[PDB]
Amino acid sequence: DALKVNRAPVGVEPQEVHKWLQSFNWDFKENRTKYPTKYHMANETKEQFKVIAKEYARMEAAKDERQFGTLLDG
Amino acid sequence: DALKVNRAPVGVEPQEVHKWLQSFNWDFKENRTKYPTKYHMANETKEQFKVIAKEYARMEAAKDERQFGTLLDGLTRLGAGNKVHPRWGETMKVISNFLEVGEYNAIAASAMLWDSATAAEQKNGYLAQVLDEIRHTHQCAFINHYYSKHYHDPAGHNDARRTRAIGPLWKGMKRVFADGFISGDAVECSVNLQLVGEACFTNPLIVAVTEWASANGDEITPTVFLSVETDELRHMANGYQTVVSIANDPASAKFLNTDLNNAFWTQQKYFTPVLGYLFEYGSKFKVEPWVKTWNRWVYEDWGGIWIGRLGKYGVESPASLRDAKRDAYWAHHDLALAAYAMWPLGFARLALPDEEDQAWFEANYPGWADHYGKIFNEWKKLGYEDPKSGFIPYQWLLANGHDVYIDRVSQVPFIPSLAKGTGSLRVHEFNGKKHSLTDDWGERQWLIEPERYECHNVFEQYEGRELSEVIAEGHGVRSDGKTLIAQPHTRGDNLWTLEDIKRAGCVFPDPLAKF
Amino acid sequence: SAHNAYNAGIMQKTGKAFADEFFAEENQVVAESNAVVLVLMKSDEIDAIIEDIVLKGGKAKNPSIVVEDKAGFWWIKADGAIEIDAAEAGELLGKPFSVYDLLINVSSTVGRAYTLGTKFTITSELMGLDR
Amino acid sequence: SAHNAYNAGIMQKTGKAFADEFFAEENQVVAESNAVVLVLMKSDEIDAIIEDIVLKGGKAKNPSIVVEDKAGFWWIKADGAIEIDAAEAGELLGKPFSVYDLLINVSSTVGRAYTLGTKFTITSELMGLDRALTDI
Amino acid sequence: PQSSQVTKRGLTDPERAAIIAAAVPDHALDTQRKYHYFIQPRWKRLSEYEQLSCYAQPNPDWIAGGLDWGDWTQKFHGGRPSWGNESTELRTTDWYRHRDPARRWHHPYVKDKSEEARYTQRFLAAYSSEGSIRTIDPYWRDEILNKYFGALLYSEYGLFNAHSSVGRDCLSDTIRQTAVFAALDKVDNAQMIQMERLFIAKLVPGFDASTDVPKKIWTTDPIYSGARATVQEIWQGVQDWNEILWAGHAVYDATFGQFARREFFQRLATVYGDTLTPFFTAQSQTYFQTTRGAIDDLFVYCLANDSEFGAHNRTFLNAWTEHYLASSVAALKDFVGLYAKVEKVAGATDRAGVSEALQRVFGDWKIDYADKIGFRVDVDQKVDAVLAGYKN
Amino acid sequence: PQSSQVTKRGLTDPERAAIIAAAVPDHALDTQRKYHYFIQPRWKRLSEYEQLSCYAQPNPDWIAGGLDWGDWTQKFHGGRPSWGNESTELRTTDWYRHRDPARRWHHPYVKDKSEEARYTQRFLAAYSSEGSIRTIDPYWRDEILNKYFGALLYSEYGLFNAHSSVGRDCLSDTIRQTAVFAALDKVDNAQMIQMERLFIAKLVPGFDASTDVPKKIWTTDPIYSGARATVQEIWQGVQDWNEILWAGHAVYDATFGQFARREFFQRLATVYGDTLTPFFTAQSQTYFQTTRGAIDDLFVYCLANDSEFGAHNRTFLNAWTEHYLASSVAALKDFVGLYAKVEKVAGATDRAGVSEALQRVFGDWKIDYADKIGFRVDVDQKVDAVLAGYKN
Amino acid sequence: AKREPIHDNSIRTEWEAKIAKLTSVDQATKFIQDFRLAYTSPFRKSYDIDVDYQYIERKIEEKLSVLKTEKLPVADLITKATTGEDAAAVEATWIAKIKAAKSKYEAERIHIEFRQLYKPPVLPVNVFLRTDAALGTVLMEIRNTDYYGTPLEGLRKERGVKVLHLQA
Ligand SMILES: [Fe+3]
Ligand SMILES: [Fe+3]
C-alpha cells in the first residue's frame, strides 16, 4: 500500500526485456518483406546473443574507449 | 503562458553555476576552522579554474579512459610490462609506492585546506583537489598492480604496503611529503604542500621521471604519471591564491619566510638524496645528471619563476638553499652507500654500477671514482652479489669505523666519515635519551619543538636482533617463504635466502652507545 | 630564445666547469626569472596543437618560445606568457573541444595559470600582487 | 592434440611437397571437421583468462585444446567445444565482468557460438539440426 | 634541433631494446601476481577496489589494524599525532574493516558521475526544445519550488562542508574514500538545485534564479530554522569524525533530508505538473542510497558489531541518535509549516497525506538504522510530534 | 613450443625495427594530412563526423553528387541497380549534402546511449530502495499506465521497423546514419516501456508486466485504431524511403507520437503522483528532439530548398503531409477517447486542458515543419477535429 | 641490549595483564594519567618501554573507554572528564593557563601536560580536540616569533641538553 513495499534494490537486466521482444510483432496482411526472394519458408527463430538497445550501446562504447585510448594516447 | 515559450535548445554550462558558489556560504558564529593556525587574515579569493562536481567528473573520467585504454589494451598486447630494464622495474617498486603515500597524505592535507578556507569558492576548489589526491593514490597503486601482473618480478610490487615497514628509507618518506604536510598549521599547507611540494618538487618527481622510465623501456609509468600531474595545475593555483592573501597582510606575512624555509629544507632533505639515488643508481640508461635535473627544475625554474618573482613582495630566497645545492651534488651518492650497504632491509633488487656507469659517474661528478667507486668495487670483490659469500656491507662499515646514524628529525641516514653532502653529527642527551641530529636546520626544529619529533628509528626498534629475523618477521620474503624480496643483483639466478643472510651474523647495534 | 633552452647557461657545462659555476657564490640565492614553463603530455590532440598553434601563431606572437622533445611530453619555455585557445584547437581537430578538454593533456606549469573563456594562459604575472 | 595445431598436417610441408598434397585429388572437396576455432584479442583480461582458465581447467576438461600466440591475438582450436564462464573470469579479475563484458575481446569463431547465463560456448554441434542424444 | 638530448626509448630503439632483452631474466622470479594478496577479502574473491585502496593509509600497530610500527615522524605542536585514537570516541579491532558495497575507488566514481553530467546537458537541451515547462503550475514554480527548493541547497552545502574535518581526521583509506565521495555528492546536490533554477530562468521571463531569496529563507524563515540549527551543529559544532558521519547521513539527512527531497519536492512535483524537478531529484536520491550503503557498512557491519567494542560503540551511537533525532524532529516540525502555503491536494498535502509521508520516513528510518543499532523508537510518537507543526 | 612461428613485431624487435627505420624516408612525402580534405565543410572547418562519414557510399556520377563512374558491377535480376534514382520521388543536385546537426558517427552515438544505459540501472536500484512507488495513484498505475502506455510500445516498434527498407534503399552515407540511429532510438523506446513495466512488477504484487493486455489493446481497442492503421501504412505500405522518413518522424510521430508520449503519459504522470514514468519519458523525448534535428536538416535545408528541385520536392512533401496529417488527426481523434477513463483534473484532463494540449502539439508542428515546406494548416481546425472525439 | 619482536613480546603481554585487573573508572583514570606522565612526551619519567608504550597506551584507553560505557550515565560521557570535573571547566582552565604563559618553554609544558592528563578517554573527544587546537594555536605563535633569533649554542642551553658530541 502507501506504507509497505519491498525496498530490496532491483533493476532490470537485458535478458529480462529480451524475453518479451518476440511478442512485439503483430499480425496484419501487409506485414511481409518488400524485397524479391526465392525463400518463403518459416523462419521464426531465436537470437543466440540476447541484446537490447541500451546493452548494445554499453558493449560497443566499452570496446571503443579502449581502442581510442590506445590510438590517441599510447 | 500555457501555449507560448522559447523553445531554443539551452543547457547550463559549468561557469554559469560556478558564479553562484560564493553565495552558498552563510554567516554564523561557529563558522570557522577547527585546526590550529597562525594565519588569521582575510582570504576571500576567486578560483582560477571554475569547476563544479559534474564537470570535475567529466574531465577526470575522460583522462582515465585514455589511460586505461593504453594500459589494458595497447601496452598489454605489446608485452610492454616486461620490456623494462630490471634496474628500472625495481626502481618503480619504490617510486610508485612511496609516491602513493605522498598522494595519500595530500588527501588529508587538502582536507585541512578545505577546512581552513573561508571562501565557498576555495572550499569548492579544495574538494576537487582532495578528490584528485585520491585519484593519484589509486593511480600509483595501479602502476604496481600492473607491474605485479606483467613484469618478471612481482615481489615487492605486490606487497610494499607492508614490506616497506622493514627498512630505513621508508621512515623518511613518512615525513617528506606526508607528516610534514599534515601535522601542523592548516593554512600553512598552502606554503608547504603547495608553494613548495606541488609547485617545486612534483615536477622532477612525477614529470621528469617519465623520461627516465621511457629511456629504460617503461611506457606504463609515463602513461599514468603524466596524467597525474595534469591535476597539479589546479593545486598550485589553489595554493597561490592563499599565499597572496598571506603576503597582503603584514601580520600574517611575518610568518611566511620562516615557514617557506622550513618547508623547503624539510622536503629537500629527503627528496634530493633519495630521488637522485633512485634516478642514477636505479637506472641503466641515464637521461642527464641528477644535479642538472635539480638545477633546471628546483634552483632555476621554481626558484626563479615562483620564489624570485615573489621577492618583489618580500619573499626571501630560502636561507637553506646553499646547503641544499651541496646536497644536490653529493647527497645522493652518500645515500647510495647506505642503500647498497643495507640492501636486505629493502624490497627491491639493486645493481652495483657497471663499468660504463662508473665512467658516467666520474665524468659528471669528478671525484666519484676515487671515493664511491672504489668502495663499490671492493664490495664486489668481497662477494656483494654472491649468496655464498657471507658478506653484507653494513658490517664492513662498522668494522672500519663508518657508523650509520639516523637524523631524529628527517629520518635520513648519515655516515659522517664518508659523506660529502651537507651534514655534521650533533648528539645530545635530553631527559635520559640520546638524539642524533645532522644539520643546522633540523637541529633547530628539534631544539625548539622536541615533542613534535619522537620518531623511533630502526636501530632503536631492532637493537641486538639478527638481520634475518627482522626480515622474516616483517614478511620480507617471496612466496616460497625463504628467498628475500630484496637482492644485491638483478639477475635471475643465485638469489639470496634468509639462511644466506643469517650466515653473515649481522646484529643491529646502538649507534649512540659510544657517546 | 637561447636563454629559454632546457640546456641553457650552466647546463651546457660538464665535469669541473659545471661544479665551479654550480658552487659559485653568486649562485647560492635564487634569481628572478621572467619565464614560464608549460608541459604538454604527448597525444594526438596535443601533437597537432604543438605543430599548428604553438609553433606557428604562438611563436610568431612570442618569438622567445622554445619547445623541446622530452620523450613522453613536450617541454615549452617562454618569456612572459604562453596561451592556447581551445576554440582554435577545436577548429583544428574537428571535434568538440572546450577549455576543459584542453586540460586533459596539460601536465604541468611553472608560472601563474588560469583559464578565461575558451583560452588557457600561463603567465609570469603575479596576479593579486602586481598591478 | 597435435591435429589441432595451426601448422598441422599439410601445413608442415613446404615447396613441392606442399603443392603435391594441396593439389591431390582427395583434397579437392571439403572434409568434415569436429573442431572449433576461437580467437581472443590480447588484453589484460584476456591474457589472464588464457593463463588461468583456458590453459588450466579448460585443458583439463578438454585435453585436445591447442593455444597459439599470433602476436595481436590468441588462436585456440579444440575438438568438440570450448567454453568460458564469465563468472569464473570475474572472480579472477576482481571487477564487474558479465558475459557481455567477456565478448569485448572475443574476436572470432569458427563453429556454432552462443551465450547462456554467464557462460560463452562455441561448439561443433549444429543446433536445430543435430538431434538430442538424451531425453534428460 | 633542440638543446637537450632526444632520449632514445628502450621499448622501440633497437640498441637499447637489445640491451634490455639481454638483462631481463628468462623466467619469473615469483609466482604471486595478485597485488596486495594479503588483504583479507570481504567477499568471495578479492576485488580490485580492495587491492587499490586497502592499507594505503600507513597506520602503525597502535592504531587498530595498522601494519607499521613506531611513532610518527612529525607531530603537531604539543604532540597531537598525524592520525590518532583521540580523533573519535568509537573503537574497533581494525579500522580497515570498512568496505563500500558499491566498491568505489576513484575511477568508477567519476565514470558514473560523468555519465550523469553529459546526459543532464542533453536532457536540458531537449527539454527546452520540447517546451514542456508550459504545463507546470505557476504558483508551485514561483512561490514554492524557486524559493524553498532553492533554500534547500544550503542544507546540502552545509552537509558537504561537515566532511572537511572528516577527510583530514578519519582513520582508514576505505573510510576516507566513502567520506569524500559522500561530500562531493552533497555539493553536487546543491549545485544541481542551482542549475535547475538557472535553467528555468532561461525559459520563464521574470523568473529570478539569484540565490538572494533562497538564502534569506534558509537563514531567517522559521520553516528552515530547525534544519539550519542542526546542520550548523553537525558541520562546525563537533569534530569526532564518526559523530559527523552518523549524525549527518544516518539521522539528519535520513529523516529531514529524505522528507524534504523525496516526500516534499519530488513527490509534490508529480502532483503540481512539474515535469522538470523529478529529473534532478532522481540524482540526489540515487546519491542518497549509494551513500547509505557505505554509511550502513561503516556503522552497522563494522562498528555496531565489532567483536570487542560493538556494545561500547552502540552506547555512543544511541546517545548521538537521541540528540540528533530530537534535532531532526524539531527541524521537520518547523518544515511542515510549508504545507500551509501550498494548494490542497487530498492524500498529498492534507493532514492524512502528510501523516503518511512522515510514517514512511520515520518507519523506513527505524528499519534502516534504528533497529540495527538497538535504538528503540516509537514511530507514531515521532509522527505526532512533527504534526504538531502542521496547520490544519 | 607451438607449431607456428612466434612472429617478431616490427615495432619492438631490434632487427626488424632497424630494417624498418632504414626503409622509412627522412621526410614526409606530402603535407596534406587532412583525411578527405576535399569534402565541402558545412561548418567553419571540416568536422571529424564529416571526414569519417562523407563519400563512404560509392555512388557514380549518375546518382546526383556521386564521384565515381560507370554502371554497378552486379544488379538485381531484371536490372534494378544496387542503388538508384528509382528509389524515391524526391530529387536533389547532391545526395551527400545532408548533415546531422548532432554530428553523430557511430562512436559518439553509442557513447551517449551507454551513459543512459548504465545510469538507468543505478536509478532503478535506488528507486526500488527508496520505496517511491508507494505514492503513485493505483488506478493510473494499473488501469492507464500499465495497459495503454504498454500498448504504445507497439507504435514505437512499428516505427522502428519502418526503417528496414530505408536502411537498404537510401542514397547517401549521412542519411543512412541518420535513419539507422533513428531506428535504434525507436526500438529503444519500445524496450524502455517494457523495462518500466517489468520493474513495476517487481515492486507491486499482482502487477502483470506481460504484453498480453497491451497487445490486445494495440490491435483491437478503438483508442489505438487510427494510430495502428497509420503505423502499418508507413512501415509496410510504401517503399519510397523519403516518404517513410517524412511521414514517420515529421508527421505521425511529431503529432500523434508527441501527444501520446509528452502530453498524455509524461504530463499526466505529474498530475497522478507518478515519480517513475518521467524518468523513462525523459529518454524518449530527448531522442525525439535529436532525431528531429537530423530529419529537419534532410527535408528542410537539403530537399525543400534544393537549388534546382526545392519546389518539386515541396509538391511531394505537401501531398504526403496532406495524407499523413489526416491519418494522424484521425489517430488523435481515436486516442483522446482515453480521457474518458481517467480521473478528471481541471486544466489537464477536462476539455479546456485537452484543447490546450492539442494547441501545443499542432501549433509547435506548424512552426517546426509545416511553415518550413509551405504547407498551409489551420491549427484551430485540427484541434476541433480531434476534440470531436473527446467525451465531455 | 636485545629487543624482543615488534608486535608480540613479554613487555606488551605483561602490561595487558595489568590492564585487565582495572575494574572502575576512577582506578583506570588514575592508571592512565600515571602512565602518560611516566612514559609519554619528552618530559616523561622513563624510556624503559619506549618501543612499546604507544601500543600499551592504546590498550589502557580501550579498557577505560569500555568501563565508561558500562558504568557511567550517558550525560557524563558528553559533559564530564573521568576525573569528575566539568569538561567545559577543564577547557577554560587550560586555555587561560597557556595564554598566561610567559615564554615558549612555559607554554610547551602546559600543552604537553594537558595532553598527558586529559587525552581521551579522560576528556570527551569533542571538548579535547577543540581545547588541544586552541592550545596549539598559542604554542605555534609564540614559537614562530623570531624563530631564527637564538643561535644554536644558545638554544642548546635554553633546552638544557647535555651535549655529547659536536662534529668538527
Ligand atoms: Fe597528487
Ligand atoms: Fe597535488
From TrEMBL, chain A:
Coiled coil: none annotated. It comes from the Bacteria. Signal peptide: none annotated. This is Methane monooxygenase component A alpha chain. It comes from Methylosinus trichosporium (strain ATCC 35070 / NCIMB 11131 / UNIQEM 75 / OB3b). The chain holds residues 12 to 85 of 526 of the full protein.
From TrEMBL, chain D:
Keywords: Monooxygenase, Oxidoreductase. Pfam families: MmoB_DmpM. Gene3D superfamilies: Monooxygenase component MmoB/DmpM. Transmembrane segments: none annotated. One of its GO terms (molecular function) is monooxygenase activity. It comes from the Bacteria. InterPro entries: MethMoxRegMmoB, MOase_MmoB_DmpM, mOase_MmoB_DmpM_sf. NCBIfam families: MethMoxRegMmoB. Belongs to the TmoD/XamoD family. This is Methane monooxygenase regulatory protein B. It comes from Methylosinus trichosporium (strain ATCC 35070 / NCIMB 11131 / UNIQEM 75 / OB3b).
From TrEMBL, chains E, F:
InterPro entries: Ferritin-like_SF, MethMoxA_beta, MP_mOase_hydro, Phenol_Hydrox, RNR-like. CDD domains: AAMH_B. Keywords: Monooxygenase, Oxidoreductase. Gene3D superfamilies: Ribonucleotide Reductase, subunit A. SUPFAM superfamilies: Ferritin-like. It comes from the Bacteria. One of its GO terms (molecular function) is oxidoreductase activity, acting on paired donors, with incorporation or reduction of molecular oxygen, NAD(P)H as one donor, and incorporation of one atom of oxygen. Pfam families: Phenol_Hydrox (PF02332). This is Methane monooxygenase.
TrEMBL record, chain G:
Signal peptide: none annotated. Pfam families: MeMO_Hyd_G. The keyword Oxidoreductase applies. InterPro entries: Me_mOase_g, Me_mOase_g_dom1, Me_mOase_g_dom2, Me_mOase_sf_g, MethMoxGammaMmoZ. One of its GO terms (molecular function) is methane monooxygenase [NAD(P)H] activity. GO terms for biological process: methane metabolic process. Keywords: Monooxygenase, Oxidoreductase. It comes from the Bacteria. NCBIfam families: MethMoxGammaMmoZ (NF045805). This is Methane monooxygenase. It comes from Methylosinus trichosporium (strain ATCC 35070 / NCIMB 11131 / UNIQEM 75 / OB3b).
